[model samples]
Target chain A: KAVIKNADMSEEMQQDAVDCATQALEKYNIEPDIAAYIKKEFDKKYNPTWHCIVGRNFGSYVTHETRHFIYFYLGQVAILLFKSG
Target chain B: KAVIKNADMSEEMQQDAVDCATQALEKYNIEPDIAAYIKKEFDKKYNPTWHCIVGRNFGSYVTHETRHFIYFYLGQVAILLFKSG
Candidate 1:
């Protein structure tokens, strides 16, 4: 499993990242741990915008990867669905 | 490999997810399958926010995972970069 960790991001930036994640998740009724992770990952080296942009960008990447995974996984499900049908 | 599949999303929501993915990728100069995938994934079971949020958050998780992979990979890269430089 791959993970993205930012140890040099500032507090505000971390918060922004969390906020972006939360916004994206809540918009879809998905459970998210944005706030907690942001607090855990927050640092004082980078600006808020940098953190936010990085976080958001990273979030987008993860989503795409997940969808790919789902597509393959669902292919199996589709087989089952078809067999049952 | 883990996957997330939603078979209950609306057309509008699916489009939103694709749009979000496309925007994020464009912003980072990364290649994304937003439009094509969005059209493929869109349905009438949910709303636009549903897909957008799901896609975006999934993206975040993938980014986090990738980052972790990078951190470890970069650890090696760092060693290599350090050795070379």
Candidate 2:
């Protein structure tokens, strides 16, 4: 049960999430289909507005919760639905 | 004496506003400067937060009140300062 949490984060933490996501995509050559699926799911559950307003100056943040959730769910779905062993 | 009003709107009406603005921009082939000016101004006055939270279910909308205001104001300014009459 990989529970990736981003319950609360500051601007710096948000930037760090972006950096981490960018690096993962760059390094792993992750599929856009998977990435987008995760983003959509996360937006649905956490921030349906697709925009997070943080702090007084209107700083926005995007977390990778959806991405991680999608990856995790996909792995589970793949194993459950298409297991060949 | 040109006063534009979008004081009240439904979700569908908001979508219509977006369509109207898109069509105007497409038909006129307007410069980004003018478009941006209007958007910024409208956002400042009407929807300072840049995102309009409308109705229920967290639906969002954007209006071109800013754009129209800018175009009208620019014309007024041009007539006042740049016109040789």
Best by lDDT: 2
Clash pairs for candidate 2:
B38-B66
Query: Model 1, A1-85: lDDT tens per residue?
Result: 1122422334453344444444433444322243323223332232121111212221111112111111111111100000000
TM-score of each candidate's B chain against the true B chain: 0.28, 0.27
Task: Show model 1 residue runs off by greater than 4 Å.
Answer: A1-85, B1-5, B29-85
- Residue-by-residue lDDT tens digits, candidate 2, A1-85: 2222233444443444444334433443323332343344335544432321111011111122233211111111110000000
* Per-residue accuracy of model 2 over B1-85 as CA lDDT, tens digit each: 2222233434443444454344434453333333344334335545532321111011111122233211111211110000000
Instruction: Give the C-alpha interface root-mean-square deviation per candidate.
Output: 14.0, 19.2
Error of 1 at A17 (Å): 22
TM-score of chain A of each: 0.28, 0.27
Strongest candidate by TM-score: 2
Model 1: per-residue Cα lDDT at residue B47: 19
